[PDB]
Amino acid sequence: SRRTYTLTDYLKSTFRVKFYTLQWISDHEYLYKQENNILLFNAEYGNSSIFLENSTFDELGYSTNDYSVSPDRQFILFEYNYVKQWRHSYTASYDIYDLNKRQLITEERIPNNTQWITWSPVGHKLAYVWNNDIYVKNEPNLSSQRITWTGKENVIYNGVTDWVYEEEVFSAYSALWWSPNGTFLAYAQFNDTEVPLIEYSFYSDESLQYPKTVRIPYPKAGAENPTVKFFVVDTRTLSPNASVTSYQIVPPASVLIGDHYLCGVTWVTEERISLQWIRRAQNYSIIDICDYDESTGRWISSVARQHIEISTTGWVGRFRPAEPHFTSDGNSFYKIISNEEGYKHICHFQTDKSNCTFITKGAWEVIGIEALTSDYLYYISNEHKGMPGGRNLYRIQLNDYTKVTCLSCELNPERCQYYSASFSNKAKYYQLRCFGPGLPLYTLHSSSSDKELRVLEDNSALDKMLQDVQMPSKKLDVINLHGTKFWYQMILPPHFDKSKKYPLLIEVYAGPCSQKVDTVFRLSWATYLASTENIIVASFDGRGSGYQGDKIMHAINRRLGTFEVEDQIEATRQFSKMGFVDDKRIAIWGWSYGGYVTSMVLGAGSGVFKCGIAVAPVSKWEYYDSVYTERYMGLPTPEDNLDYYRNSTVMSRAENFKQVEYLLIHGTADDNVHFQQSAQLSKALVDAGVDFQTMWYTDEDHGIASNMAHQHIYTHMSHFLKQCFSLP
């Protein structure tokens, strides 16, 4: 026990944190890949059975990265040849295996380079996208029926999102929604025709004699956006000799006026579908409940069935309006919206009415709704011990909003304060995933009596390994800024000697609705800095952050680069007042927004920080995509918010950099925050005669996650830091 958590321990993950992944296929049974073989687990008893032996897994092409079984358990889908694209997107090859015949389907296979594929809700239909067009396979071995013909690379998307909807509006590649019983298949169609193209070089493998130019339809603040169309297809008439039967649903008049987005799709019943649209502005979204008319095939909507959500201080929801949770009969629904006091809370809605009733209230927020039986409502919130960085499972009794109980609060009060859950089909069971403050813990529960049932994964192996290495200690706490109570966290080195003055590192994100202060357990770069380098690392959630109410979160509305930056400075000061902090050796580092924030801090000329590192940071908001940017800044026009766009650019503070040591990093293949941003920033600094450091990473993207790149960037930021702090 005379060794520490080294840099290599971090980069090689020599300390394995185990998890437990399962899939609910019934209301009490779940699948679990063990020793390379799926097993069916019976939640009620704990007894399992082989659902698919390993061996049967014959490295088809490469490796079986993912599998999905049809709902009737007659077939299982195998995914191989996975080729990542953006953040959620990717292509792959797919095999379908017959669990009856126990053979592999060989006639009529799924196309190579498939973009998205999915079993229908019931039975074993399949819907999939390929070359931006949709295809429906009722039966596996049979042929597939093409549903669209407009698909075109980089221009028209049927069933899958383009770059901006994938990154900022759905957070997923898919834009396909089967009806509850497989009758209808809904999809979105995207048109990127007038969206400008972002282009950059991809050098590829050393042997390529000429670099390639990657081209992506990418709308930057204020530029032409992709347009959208929604379609509902009746798969009943899908026939090789038949036209396709589909109805196009348009947005209510209030959104249809100017530019807009489609932010959500939720089937209520085989004949009732809920669409949620939001305006480009984003301080006005609306739910439109549409019902099928059996006599015309049309899908009708109406005023009685529309619900408008707006914001006067900013944008709707956290990163999009929260999703509606309908009751089985679909006549009412539950959904999180801001308070009269700005706290996110569950309101109960009537499908054909306009008034709603909150069933939760308090100086805390509801993170999300987890399940909804005819009796209870299961959700997750940060109310416990009033700390916003905590997560717990609650169950509220629908006939008495007073009868609210906490299922995770007391299970392991010290080790578990941050949870997420996975409910079984009817909410008879759930798995409780504890991500911290102690080692992660996975357990299974019965909804009937709320009994421990059993433990799925306690990371007892990890714990064993750690008590033979000097780990850092992390403490959460509050500090006061301009009246408001704010949270912070410090990763303190081992053998904490208060008489000693320790160099301090601020690890910062600080983007709207962000939260860098929580109880999640993490084995990170800071672990190594605290443990081995004896550097205290801290984080602060100030104005603009989230899960604390709109007042705090909407604070930076239309003025990014201001309060959240200042607040980091103001808080580091207090941190420097303390005695174990060597106020003459403090740095600040951050990625993406945090790389932006960090850069603004250094150019602030507060003389508080000695140095900082910015990795793939936003430098000028007119360079970032438009869905995100415009949500917090409006349009860059002098008739709107041009002035605050122009003065929140890191380049505007170039001269102050003459006062600190700056390390600038970016991947030449960043498709998210373009390399342009840092190229433009370093050019402004050269032009201001400022000296600094840079580190470009050839062909790496926003995550600089290739193995060698990952190792190298961290190894590099550590040398820069030990030099900024003159450490051995």
Ligand X SMILES: *[B]([O])([O])[C]1[C][C][C]N1C(=O)[C]1[C][C][C][N]1
Ligand Y SMILES: *[C@@H]1O[C@H](CO)[C@@H](O)[C@H](O)[C@H]1NC(C)=O
Ligand Z SMILES: *[C@@H]1O[C@H](CO)[C@@H](O[C@@H]2O[C@H](CO)[C@@H](O)[C@H](O)[C@H]2NC(C)=O)[C@H](O)[C@H]1NC(C)=O
Ligand U SMILES: *[C@@H]1O[C@H](CO)[C@@H](O[C@@H]2O[C@H](CO)[C@@H](O[C@@H]3O[C@H](CO)[C@@H](O)[C@H](O)[C@@H]3O)[C@H](O)[C@H]2NC(C)=O)[C@H](O)[C@H]1NC(C)=O
Active site residues: 592, 670, 702
* 629-658: contacts with ligand Y (CB under 6 A): 634
CB of 568 to ligand Y, least distance (A): 27
* 592-621: contacts with a copy of itself (CB under 8 A): 620
Residue 239: contacted member of a copy of itself, ligand Y, ligand X, none (CB under 5 to 8 Å, by partner type): ligand Y
**Nearest alpha-carbon partner for 280 in 631, 605, 720, 20:** 631
CB of 507 to a copy of itself, least distance (A): 22
CB of 54 to ligand U, least distance (A): 4
Q: Around 669, how many Cα atoms within 13 Å sit in the side-chain half-sphere?
A: 19
Does residue 628 interact with ligand X by CB under 6 A? yes
Answer for the pair 496, 517: CB distance below 8 angstroms, yes or no: no
Q: Which of 8, 21, 54, 171 binds ligand U (CB under 6 A)?
A: 54
Distances (CA, A) of 123 to 69, 181, 186, 368: 10, 9, 17, 30
- The Cα–Cα gap between 362 and 434 comes to 24
Q: Which is nearer to ligand Y, 481 or 635 (CB)?
A: 635
CA 519 to chain centre: 18
- The Cα–Cα gap between 393 and 719 comes to 43
Q: Which of 6, 23, 26, 37 binds ligand U (CB under 6 A)?
A: 37
Distances (CA, A) of 92 to 62, 267, 421: 11, 28, 29
CB of 155 to ligand Z, least distance (A): 7
Is the N-terminal amide bond of 437 cis, ω within 30° of 0? yes
String of contacts with ligand X for each residue 505-534, x by CB under 6 A: ------x-----------------------
Pairing mode, strands 581-591 and 502-507 = parallel
Distances (CA, A) of 10 to 358, 503, 506, 724: 45, 21, 19, 21
- The Cα–Cα gap between 187 and 133 comes to 11
CB of 642 to ligand Y, least distance (A): 12
- For 68, the token pair is 């999905």
CB of 171 to ligand X, least distance (A): 7
| Cβ-based burial of 724 (10 A; exposed 0-12, middle 13-18, buried ≥19) | buried
Residue 684: contacted member of ligand U, a copy of itself, ligand X, none (CB under 5 to 8 Å, by partner type): a copy of itself
* 547-566: contacts with ligand Z (CB under 6 A): 561-562
Does residue 281 interact with ligand Y by CB under 6 A? yes
Element (H, E) at 594: helix 593-603
Residue 241: contacted member of ligand U, ligand Y, ligand Z, none (CB under 5 to 8 Å, by partner type): ligand Y
**Nearest alpha-carbon partner for 492 in 505, 470, 474, 469:** 474
Number of residues that bind a copy of itself (CB under 8 A): 46
Q: Which is nearer to ligand Z, 189 or 534 (CB)?
A: 189
DSSP secondary structure, 112-168, as one string: TTB-EEEE-SSTT-EEEEETTEEEEESSSSSPPEE--S--BTTTEEESB--HHIIII
Q: Which of 697, 701, 702, 725 binds a copy of itself (CB under 8 A)?
A: 697
* Backbone dihedral angles phi then psi of residue 652, each to the nearest 5 degrees: -65, -15
Q: Which is nearer to ligand Y, 64 or 351 (CB)?
A: 64
CB of 31 to ligand Y, least distance (A): 10
Q: Which is nearer to ligand X, 38 or 618 (CB)?
A: 618
Does residue 36 interact with ligand U by CB under 6 A? yes
Does residue 718 interact with ligand X by CB under 6 A? no
* 26-55: contacts with a copy of itself (CB under 8 A): none
Does residue 48 interact with ligand U by CB under 6 A? no
Q: Which residues make up the interface to ligand Z (CB under 6 A)?
A: 150, 156, 191, 193-194, 561-562, 644, 647-648
Q: Which residues make up the interface to ligand Y (CB under 6 A)?
A: 35-37, 40, 42, 45, 47-49, 54, 150, 156, 191, 193-194, 239-241, 281, 283, 310-312, 634
Q: Which residues make up the interface to ligand X (CB under 6 A)?
A: 167-168, 511, 592-593, 618, 628, 672-673
